[PDB]
Amino acid sequence: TTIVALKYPGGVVMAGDRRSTQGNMISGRDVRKVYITDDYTATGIAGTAAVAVEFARLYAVELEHYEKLEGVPLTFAGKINRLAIMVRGNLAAAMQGLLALPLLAGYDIHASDPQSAGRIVSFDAAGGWNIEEEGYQAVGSGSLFAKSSMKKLYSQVTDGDSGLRVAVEALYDAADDDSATGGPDLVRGIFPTAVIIDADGAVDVPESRIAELARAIIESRS
Amino acid sequence: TTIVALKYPGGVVMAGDRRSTQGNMISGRDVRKVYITDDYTATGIAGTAAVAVEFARLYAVELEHYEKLEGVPLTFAGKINRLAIMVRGNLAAAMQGLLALPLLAGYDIHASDPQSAGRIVSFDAAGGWNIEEEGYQAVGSGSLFAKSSMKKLYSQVTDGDSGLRVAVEALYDAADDDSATGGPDLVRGIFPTAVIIDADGAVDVPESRIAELARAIIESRSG
Amino acid sequence: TTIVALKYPGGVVMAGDRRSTQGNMISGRDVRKVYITDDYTATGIAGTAAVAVEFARLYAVELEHYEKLEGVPLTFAGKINRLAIMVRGNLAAAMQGLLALPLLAGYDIHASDPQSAGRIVSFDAAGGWNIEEEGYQAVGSGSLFAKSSMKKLYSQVTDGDSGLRVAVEALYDAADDDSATGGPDLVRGIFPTAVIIDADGAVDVPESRIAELARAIIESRS
Amino acid sequence: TTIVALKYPGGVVMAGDRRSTQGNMISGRDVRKVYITDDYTATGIAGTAAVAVEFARLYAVELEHYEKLEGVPLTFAGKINRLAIMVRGNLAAAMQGLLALPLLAGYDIHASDPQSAGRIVSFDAAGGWNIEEEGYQAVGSGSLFAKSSMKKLYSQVTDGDSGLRVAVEALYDAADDDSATGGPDLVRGIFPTAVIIDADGAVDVPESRIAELARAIIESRSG
Amino acid sequence: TTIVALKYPGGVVMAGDRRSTQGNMISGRDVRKVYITDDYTATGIAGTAAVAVEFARLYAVELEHYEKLEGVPLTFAGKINRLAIMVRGNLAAAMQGLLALPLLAGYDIHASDPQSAGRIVSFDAAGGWNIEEEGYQAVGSGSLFAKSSMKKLYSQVTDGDSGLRVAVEALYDAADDDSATGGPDLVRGIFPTAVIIDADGAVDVPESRIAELARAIIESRS
Amino acid sequence: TTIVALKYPGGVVMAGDRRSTQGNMISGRDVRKVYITDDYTATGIAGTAAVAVEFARLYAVELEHYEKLEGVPLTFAGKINRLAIMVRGNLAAAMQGLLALPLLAGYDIHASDPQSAGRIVSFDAAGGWNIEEEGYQAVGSGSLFAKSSMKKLYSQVTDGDSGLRVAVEALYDAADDDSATGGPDLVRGIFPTAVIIDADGAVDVPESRIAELARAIIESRSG
Amino acid sequence: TTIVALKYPGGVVMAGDRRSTQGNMISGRDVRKVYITDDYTATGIAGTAAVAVEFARLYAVELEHYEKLEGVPLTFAGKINRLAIMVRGNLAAAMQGLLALPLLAGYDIHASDPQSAGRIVSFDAAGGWNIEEEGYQAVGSGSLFAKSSMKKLYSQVTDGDSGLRVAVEALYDAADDDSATGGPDLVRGIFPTAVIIDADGAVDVPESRIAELARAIIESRSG
Ligand SMILES: COC[C@H](NC(=O)[C@H](CC(=O)NOC(C)(C)C)NC(=O)c1cc(C)on1)C(=O)NCc1cccc2ccccc12
Ligand SMILES: COC[C@H](NC(=O)[C@H](CC(=O)NOC(C)(C)C)NC(=O)c1cc(C)on1)C(=O)NCc1cccc2ccccc12
Ligand SMILES: COC[C@H](NC(=O)[C@H](CC(=O)NOC(C)(C)C)NC(=O)c1cc(C)on1)C(=O)NCc1cccc2ccccc12
Ligand SMILES: COC[C@H](NC(=O)[C@H](CC(=O)NOC(C)(C)C)NC(=O)c1cc(C)on1)C(=O)NCc1cccc2ccccc12
Ligand SMILES: COC[C@H](NC(=O)[C@H](CC(=O)NOC(C)(C)C)NC(=O)c1cc(C)on1)C(=O)NCc1cccc2ccccc12
Ligand SMILES: COC[C@H](NC(=O)[C@H](CC(=O)NOC(C)(C)C)NC(=O)c1cc(C)on1)C(=O)NCc1cccc2ccccc12
Ligand SMILES: COC[C@H](NC(=O)[C@H](CC(=O)NOC(C)(C)C)NC(=O)c1cc(C)on1)C(=O)NCc1cccc2ccccc12
């Protein structure tokens, strides 16, 4: 698994691969790991599939639950604290093999500057968290390759489209060096999934755009 | 990790590094470990990140909770006892790897002499505490280097600025001998965080003065 | 520890960091990890210091021993096999904590094409080896970060100078993300060690050149 | 145990404390831990007493053995390699509790400049070694405190005597923060042992000189 | 740690050293291990600092609690029983390393003879206790050296001052043979703490007198 | 530890030594191991001191409690069952090292023959018990030696004094072969404690009397 | 077990108790633990009986063997080194429970000053040794009590007789606080064994003098 998220002027982008494995065997090619959990936040999770899906689902339910009960959504800090408390809740099972780590990307509608309102938060198995001031982050077995790629490709990020490109290329390098992360399947037409979040909210990036960016990277490398 | 705190005439200073690690890997460069827990108290914590942040947050809430309920803040002894009780509460989990040790620095507004009203209190995993009557203390994987540096540099502390400088220098020696402690990152402009507390209260030291003290020490060591 | 090696047109370069650690504690700043083992080969080793220096020293002695006994040096394949057998000999102790992995860089004087006579060979704890065809390779606790940096910077290698620059930059990224790898110490003036090898043999790169490249990289990043 | 060694202009100095312990119990007050191993090298050992003394004894015998067999002393590098091979020989017993680490101080008569001919070499349990070019080094349970003291006191080293003072003061700080390291006993008149090495060879520092330096340090610390 | 207590005609004395250790490291020089627990009782504790201080504090609270609730202080036997029950309560934690043993010194205001009203009680980790008639007792890592010293010096005890001296000298021998016990620090001016208890109650011995006696013994041995 | 009890015509006697040990170290010389638990019953206990005293105190309280609640003391069988249930209750702690075994001696006022009203009951760590129909019994680390001595000396028991004597002599042989059992300390004047019980109740034997018997035995052994 | 040795003007004295135990059980009252190993050295050993006596026997044989082969006895340093090497050889078995530590007292015929020619050397399980300058030393389960007693009684040592008295009194205090060490048995007439060594050699001290000193000490403590 590899999930990337990066800040661009006025927004954030998050993308994740599509592969599911049981040991060395490939058990899935179309799996979705990045979910829109609220109008201004997306979550991508790596680890045991059952645990990850329950995380995303229950988290979305918790945020909207608070919103309907109290008439206003949580502050971003609140969203972070709730996700952290959930992650730490799972620590016992994680020590027994049911480990799952999330990566949170959001747009803080209450931020001062609408261009640096993007937010990227990473978490550890004990619920600790860090708000990323450096612009990008990743999670999963390929996260090191993706972070190290984005370290070199990040200067090219000037808008949402260049940022999406850099994200997909980071996933490309991750899948290049990690067998548990799946690259773009040009035969089956399966590509990473991506979500973009700006002042207008969070929207799923269409499959075709990701396809074009993939083929562009592939032919750039040949 | 290294957190240092020292008393200067009429106040106390506490500063902490910015590095977060998973084993040998550097997982963070901007992490904040020193928090103002109440108008006259700051706490810096070392150890598992999750437990450290939960400690600081819950502790701040506990103090102010008492203050709003009873109309007066806790005595400093009370603050000490509460932090200790919290740590001892965590001892069981700590023995399973979730260890976190705090260091408390405060200004006792009810003390007899406002010159020596500074307080530095250290803790162990079992809830033990020591009120330091020798002027400085540190906690974390680099704490020994920082204490031994302050042992030689402490005689130079006469003002808030000299004390702050000695603190950041202690963190410098710590980062010099401990890879788990982050030194000043001059490329990214990331420096230790510091909080100073005197009779006027507790304030975060502005980043600029820390950068100036860092770059000053770095230049001071280059021949 | 991080040791890097890359091929450039007509030669090969190898560089290594200078840090020695005992757990979290820094026990050395001037440590040398890359050794010229013969007129046309250098070896860099990662792991337990005692075992690493013992490997380098014993290996150089073994190569020159064969050379004086039989009047001609070993073929490069032979040098590879002997280093491999040494690593495989240490496997038992390696499982008990005395692990050391080598990285071999050489210039094959018997190669057909002299512009591609550079050789980079990597090893595993069981004595397996691979002659690296992609131009670069690394070993050590920061090797993943350095490989991912070279993956992006390798297009810039056209001579010995650009290749050396890329090597030092890879070590810079390694030290940037790995606390067990030491970066350039501008206060003490301690920089990585490097060895460069071409048709004229293997020579130590003078420290002042590595330094100039270091400041170039740092400055480039501010 | 704490053994310190530092380079001074034209020579090297090595000193060690006098305490022997069984856990918390003090089983010795006068033990000698720094030995003259040959005309131009001294060795100090920390760890299990039996293994430490056997190290020093056997090592001296081995060096003089080579000298008598081949008519010339070993090169300094050769001396290093032999001590290292010995330690690595003890690795297994060290894993079972009989650990002993040496610290080597010497004067290389074949060095280029007779000014920086001092040599200080440290070792690890597996036989690894480091030639220390930063001028000072220590080994033992108090080595971190002593190293951190010398890091601040080293600029005062300008001759053999200032270096000797800095050695004794480092051992003082070590004993100050480490209970397994013994400080100067003014009641019994027992002080650290020292060896000085220059071009004229290695000689024991006389007890009276060290006593003077110790008392100066003590009464300097009591105002 | 070493805590000593001895009976003198018409009273009792208790003294304790000032050192705090973490293994071999000295983590404290000024700690106080002897506490006045009520107008006629003092307690000194050895072992884990946290447990020791909580013992002294909670014990004082318990005694004064009974006194205010029922209008009369506990009988000495009662005080003994409560301290014992506390120590027994801690047995499990002690078995996992948080061991702390107290030593109790008091003046029994209800005693038959007002000259033998001093009381010294020792405890073990399981809540057992012994009322000491041999006249002296000690606890801590140096307790054997101090007891064996007092066995020889006790005949010199005839009043409060001779008894205090003998106590400080016992602590001197304790610190002399035990690295976990601190002797008098003439540089910092830190000396053992002592409490004296007679018919007028329990009062802290001023630091000046203990310092004088410590110097007398030191210069007596040189 | 050694506690003995034996029946004589019209009564029962129980005696115990005075030594307390922590491993090989002697931690007590004046200790008391035999307690009068009610007007007609005494208990002697061996094992961990804390558990033993808790047994004696709690047991006495339980018996007198029943007596005040129901207006009549328990039958002897009932007392037996209560001690048994207490001992069984302690089984878990006993496995983990807090072992304590009692020996019960009493005078049954409801017996048919007032000369055979003496009772001796022994217990095991799991609460099993046996009423001793043979005149003597002992418990503790020297219990085997005391039993083997009484096996040879029991023929001489005809009254309270002869029985008391055989008892003290059994304690003498026990202390003679077991270092955890203390013999008579003629220097400090510390002797075993004894309790005698007849139709007139249970009384402590005065220290002076046992002293006389000890000296008598010692003289008999010197020829 | 307790073995003591102390230097007196011009000689050395060693004495040891007579008790042998299997755990808490006393399996011996007459054992000898101090042996004359050569004309000028005696050794007393504590620990497993089999290993201890084997040490004494084998050591005596080794020394006399060297003397007959080479025509001259070993230097004292040589004797120490051989005893230490033997102890070290036993380390493996010792960690398996067959531990035995010796204590060596001798008279060095090659010493400069015949008044300070007495030598007392102690050993640990790994073969380490210390030559005792402090004047006295002991080994065994009661060694700490005996050493702490001699610490107060040593000023009274002025000749062989005062030294012997101080040794016996040390063994008395050791046996007073340690159950594995036997005190003087006045009923059986068994007392510690002692050996005295001066320029005329090493001789067994006659039992009568030890008995006289024992009764003197006993009366001194019983008013
Ligand atoms: C590191 O481990 C790899 C992990 N693999 C896994 O998590 C696999 C999931 C799997 O293959 N299931 O089979 C089907 C349902 C697809 C047919 N666990 C297990 O097989 C498993 C776990 C336990 C316990 O027993 N079996 C993974 O693929 N993780 C990626 C992932 C992330 C977010 C959402 C996902 C949803 C579905 C599948 C994968 C998802
Ligand atoms: C265990 O000693 C090292 C410790 N490391 C840590 O505490 C790390 C924190 C971490 O790496 N998180 O990664 C993110 C959140 C940045 C993505 N825990 C763990 O890796 C961990 C432990 C268990 C169990 O599961 N995970 C540390 O560096 N501690 C330093 C530290 C001290 C005070 C406040 C802090 C606040 C935030 C981060 C760090 C802080
Ligand atoms: C195990 O990863 C950390 C490793 N460190 C080490 O390997 C250290 C070396 C060390 O610190 N020694 O201290 C002094 C006295 C030499 C200064 N060994 C040990 O700590 C060690 C291993 C055993 C067994 O016992 N001790 C390391 O830094 N390795 C890097 C390294 C690679 C190649 C050549 C080197 C030569 C010298 C020093 C380091 C070298
Ligand atoms: C490792 O822990 C501390 C170490 N202590 C020690 O090593 C002690 C020494 C000791 O007390 N011996 O007692 C006699 C010889 C005095 C009777 N042995 C053991 O604890 C020991 C360990 C095993 C196994 O067997 N014995 C020490 O103090 N070491 C300091 C030291 C360093 C160099 C040379 C020395 C020579 C003599 C004495 C000490 C020396
Ligand atoms: C291991 O037995 C030794 C024991 N040491 C200790 O108890 C030390 C005390 C300590 O160093 N704390 O650190 C600060 C707060 C001083 C900075 N804790 C621990 O070793 C410890 C235990 C666990 C679990 O985690 N840490 C001790 O010194 N005990 C002596 C002692 C007795 C009575 C009252 C005391 C009060 C304060 C300090 C000491 C006191
Ligand atoms: C375990 O067999 C030996 C046992 N000894 C003991 O039980 C000792 C007693 C002791 O030394 N206490 O300290 C003071 C209060 C005396 C200073 N505790 C322990 O060994 C002990 C056990 C645990 C757990 O922690 N400590 C013993 O001697 N038992 C004999 C005994 C029997 C009946 C009543 C007694 C009353 C007081 C003392 C002893 C008594
Ligand atoms: C376990 O530490 C105590 C030790 N006791 C002992 O060493 C006892 C001696 C013993 O009782 N043997 O029984 C006979 C010989 C009387 C039949 N061995 C054992 O208990 C033992 C150990 C193993 C293994 O198997 N048996 C001891 O008493 N040591 C004292 C001692 C020291 C020097 C010379 C001695 C000579 C004879 C007897 C004792 C001597």
Structure tokens at E41: 């009782």
Q: Do E63 and E85 form a contact (C-beta atoms < 8 A)?
A: no
Distance CA E189, CA D153 (A): 25
The three-class DSSP label of residue A164 is: helix
The DSSP secondary structure of chain C, one letter per residue, reads: -EEEEEEETTEEEEEE---EEETTEEEESS---EEEEETTEEEEEEE-HHHHHHHHHHHHHHHHHHHHHHSSPPPHHHHHHHHHHHHHHTHHHHHTT--EEEEEEEE-TT-S-GGG-EEEEEE-TTS-EEE--SSEEEEETTHHHHHHHHHHHGGG--SHHHHHHHHHHHHHHHHHHBTTS---BTTTTB--EEEEEETTEEEEPPHHHHHHHHHHHHHHH-
* C158 phi, psi to nearest 5 deg: -130, -15
CB D53 to CB G130 under 8 A?
A: no
Q: Where are the alpha helices (DSSP H) in chain F?
A: 49-70, 76-89, 91-95, 143-153, 160-177, 207-222
User: Looking at domain B1-223, does it have CATH number 1.10.10.10?
Assistant: no
DSSP state letter for F185: B
Q: Do F195 and F13 form a contact (C-beta atoms < 8 A)?
A: yes
Q: How far is CA A149 from CA C145, C169, F156, in A?
A: 9, 14, 100
The three-class DSSP label of residue D78 is: helix
Name beta bridge partners: E120.
E105
3-state helix/strand/coil string of B57-111: HHHHHHHHHHHHHHCCCCCHHHHHHHHHHHHHHHHHHHHCCCCEEEEEEEECCCC
DSSP state letter for F136: E
The three-class DSSP label of residue F23 is: coil
- Other Cβ atoms less than 10 A from the Cβ of C188: the count is 14
Q: Which atom of ligand 7 is nearest to the CA of G46?
A: 32
Question: Does B126 contact ligand 5 (Cβ within 6 A)?
Answer: yes
Nearest CB among E20, E29, E48 relative to B126 is that of E48
Q: Which atom of ligand 3 is nearest to the CA of D129?
A: 16
Contact residues, chain G to chain F, C-beta under 8 Å = 19, 21, 24-26, 141, 176-180, 187, 218, 221-222
Sheet of E3-8: strands edge to edge? E136-139, E3-8, E11-16, E193-198, E201-204
How far does the centroid of ligand 5 lie from the alpha carbon of residue B3, in Å?
20
The three-class DSSP label of residue A118 is: strand
Name beta bridge partners: G47.
G100
Q: How far is CA B113 from CA B41, B73, B107, B199, in A?
A: 18, 19, 11, 11
Structure tokens at B37: 């827990």
Q: How far is CA E172 from CA E3, E101, E144, G134, in A?
A: 11, 21, 13, 18
How far does the centroid of ligand 7 lie from the alpha carbon of residue G182, in Å?
14
Structure tokens at A169: 């290329």
How remote is the C-alpha of D132 from its chain's centroid? 13
Our answer on whether F and B touch (3+ beta-carbon pairs < 8 Å) is: no
Question: Does B125 contact ligand 5 (Cβ within 6 A)?
Answer: yes
CA atoms within 13 A on the CB side of B22: 10
Q: How far is CA C105 from CA C58, C102, C194, C201, C213, in A?
A: 17, 10, 12, 12, 21
Distance CA E11, CA C71 (A): 96
Q: Do C123 and C47 form a contact (C-beta atoms < 8 A)?
A: no
Q: Do F105 and F12 form a contact (C-beta atoms < 8 A)?
A: yes
The DSSP secondary structure of chain G, one letter per residue, reads: --EEEEEETTEEEEEE---EEETTEEEESS---EEEEETTEEEEEEE-HHHHHHHHHHHHHHHHHHHHHHSSPPPHHHHHHHHHHHHHHTHHHHHTT--EEEEEEEE-TT-S-GGG-EEEEEE-TTS-EEE--SSEEEESTTHHHHHHHHHHHGGG--SHHHHHHHHHHHHHHHHHHBTTS---BTTTTB--EEEEEETTEEEEPPHHHHHHHHHHHHHHH--
Nearest CB among B31, B51, B98 relative to A130 is that of B31
Q: Do B145 and B174 form a contact (C-beta atoms < 8 A)?
A: yes
Neighbour-count burial of E35, counting CB atoms closer than 10 A to its CB (0-12 exposed, 13-18 middle, 19+ buried): buried
CB C151 to CB A173 under 8 A?
A: yes
Residue tagged 């005190």 (tokens): G183
Distance CA G35, CA G14 (A): 10
Residues 6+ apart with CB under 8 A from B62: B82, B86
Angle in degrees, 0-180, between the axes of helices F160-177 and F143-153, rounded to the nearest 10:
140
Task: Pick the catalytic residue from C1, C37, C41, C43.
Answer: C1
User: Looking at domain A1-222, does it have CATH number 3.40.50.1010?
Assistant: no
Domain spans, chain A:
1-222
CA dihedral B42, B46, B47, B48 (to 10 degrees): 40
Instruction: Give the closest residue (by CA) to ligand 3 atom 36.
Output: C49
The secondary structure element, H or E, covering residue A86 is helix A76-89
Q: Which amino acid is at F193?
A: T
Sheet of B100-107: strands edge to edge? B34-38, B41-47, B100-107, B118-123, B129-131
The three-class DSSP label of residue A120 is: strand
The DSSP secondary structure of D165-185, one letter per residue, reads: HHHHHHHHHHHHHBTTS---B
Residues 6+ apart with CB under 8 A from F168: F15, F191, F192, F194, F210, F213, F214, F217
The three-class DSSP label of residue D205 is: coil
CA atoms within 13 A on the CB side of A6: 32
Structure tokens at E99: 């061991």
Nearest CB among C29, C30, C49 relative to D128 is that of C49
The DSSP secondary structure of F107-123, one letter per residue, reads: E-TT-SSTTS-EEEEEE
Q: Do A48 and A100 form a contact (C-beta atoms < 8 A)?
A: yes
- Over its C-alpha atoms, chain D yields an Rg (Å, rounded) of 17
The secondary structure element, H or E, covering residue E193 is strand E193-198
Structure tokens at D96: 């079972």
Distance CA F74, CA F68 (A): 11
Find the angle CA(F207)-CA(F209)-CA(F212) to the nearest 5 degrees.
110
Q: Do F207 and F185 form a contact (C-beta atoms < 8 A)?
A: no
CB E50 to CB B130 under 8 A?
A: no
Structure tokens at A27: 């058990």
DSSP state letter for A155: G
Q: Do A55 and A80 form a contact (C-beta atoms < 8 A)?
A: no
Of F200, F207, F204, F198, which is closest to residue F8 (Cα–Cα)? F198
Resolution in angstroms comes to 3.1
Neighbour-count burial of D81, counting CB atoms closer than 10 A to its CB (0-12 exposed, 13-18 middle, 19+ buried): middle
Q: How far is CA A25 from CA A158, A177, A180, D172, in A?
A: 39, 17, 9, 63
Q: How many residues are recorded in chain A?
A: 222
Residues 6+ apart with CB under 8 A from B15: B3, B4, B5, B34, B44, B164, B167, B168, B171, B192, B193, B194, B195, B205, B210
Residues 6+ apart with CB under 8 A from D26: D19, D20, E176, E177, E178, E179
3-state helix/strand/coil string of chain B: CCEEEEEECCEEEEEECCCEEECCEEEECCCCCEEEEECCEEEEEEECHHHHHHHHHHHHHHHHHHHHHHCCCCCHHHHHHHHHHHHHHHHHHHHCCCCEEEEEEEECCCCCCCCCCEEEEEECCCCCEEECCCCEEEECCCHHHHHHHHHHHHHHCCCHHHHHHHHHHHHHHHHHHECCCCCCECCCCECCEEEEEECCEEEECCHHHHHHHHHHHHHHHCC
Residues of D in contact with C53 (CB under 8 A): 128
Distance CA E104, CA E38 (A): 11
Q: Which atom of ligand 4 is nearest to the CA of D28?
A: 16
Cα distance from C220 to chain D (closest Cα, Å)?
31
Structure tokens at G53: 């006596």
Structure tokens at F215: 């000296």
Name beta bridge partners: B136.
B6
The three-class DSSP label of residue E141 is: coil
Neighbour-count burial of C61, counting CB atoms closer than 10 A to its CB (0-12 exposed, 13-18 middle, 19+ buried): exposed
Question: Does G125 contact ligand 4 (Cβ within 6 A)?
Answer: yes
- Residue C71, sorted as left (phi over 0), alpha (psi -120 to 50) or beta, turns out to be left
The secondary structure element, H or E, covering residue A152 is helix A143-153
How remote is the C-alpha of A98 from its chain's centroid? 20
Distance CA B11, CA B7 (A): 6
> In terms of C-beta distances under 8 Å and separation of at least 24 residues, what long-range contacts does G54-59 make, across chains too?
G55/G86, G55/G87, G55/G90, G55/G100, G55/G102, G56/G102, G58/G86, G59/G83, G59/G86
CB A88 to CB B50 under 8 A?
A: yes
Q: Which atom of ligand 6 is nearest to the CA of E129?
A: 15
Find the angle CA(B140)-CA(B146)-CA(B148) to the nearest 5 degrees.
125
The three-class DSSP label of residue A79 is: helix
Pairing mode of beta strands A11-16, A193-198: antiparallel
Q: Which amino acid is at B208?
A: S
CB G128 to CB D48 under 8 A?
A: yes
Nearest CB among B26, B179, B218 relative to C26 is that of B179
The secondary structure element, H or E, covering residue D56 is helix D49-70
Sheet of F129-131: strands edge to edge? F34-38, F41-47, F100-107, F118-123, F129-131
- Over its C-alpha atoms, chain E yields an Rg (Å, rounded) of 16
Contact residues, chain E to chain F, C-beta under 8 Å = 84, 88, 124, 126-128, 130, 133-134
Sheet of E41-47: strands edge to edge? E34-38, E41-47, E100-107, E118-123, E129-131
Return the percent helix, strand and coil in chain D, to nearest 5: 40, 30, 30
- Other Cβ atoms less than 10 A from the Cβ of G131: the count is 15
Distance CA B115, CA B10 (A): 4
Residues of B in contact with A130 (CB under 8 A): 20, 27-28, 31, 49
Q: Do D118 and D107 form a contact (C-beta atoms < 8 A)?
A: yes
Residues 6+ apart with CB under 8 A from C214: C168, C172, C184, C186, C191
Distance CA G83, CA G59 (A): 7
Residue tagged 């280029």 (tokens): D112
Q: Do C104 and C132 form a contact (C-beta atoms < 8 A)?
A: no
CA atoms within 13 A on the CB side of F114: 6
Distance CA B128, CA B122 (A): 8
* A95 phi, psi to nearest 5 deg: -60, -20
Tell me the technique behind this structure. Answer: X-ray
CB C187 to CB B24 under 8 A?
A: no
Structure tokens at D85: 């091979």
Q: Which atom of ligand 5 is nearest to the CA of B91?
A: 24
Residues 6+ apart with CB under 8 A from G189: G211
Nearest CB among C21, C177, C187 relative to B179 is that of C21
Residues of G in contact with F222 (CB under 8 A): 187
- Other Cβ atoms less than 10 A from the Cβ of E215: the count is 13
How far does the centroid of ligand 6 lie from the alpha carbon of residue E90, in Å?
17
How far does the centroid of ligand 3 lie from the alpha carbon of residue C50, in Å?
7
Distance CA G6, CA G4 (A): 7
DSSP state letter for E30: S
Distance CA B62, CA A13 (A): 38
C110-138 burial code (b ≥16 CB/10 A, e <16): eeeeeeebbbbbbbeeebebeebeebbbb
Find the angle CA(A190)-CA(A193)-CA(A198) to the nearest 5 degrees.
150
Contact residues, chain D to chain B, C-beta under 8 Å = 144-145, 148-149, 151-153, 173, 177
Distance CA G170, CA G172 (A): 5
Residues 6+ apart with CB under 8 A from D217: D165, D168, D169, D172
Q: Which amino acid is at G178?
A: D
Please tell me the number of the ligand nearest to residue G92's CA.
4
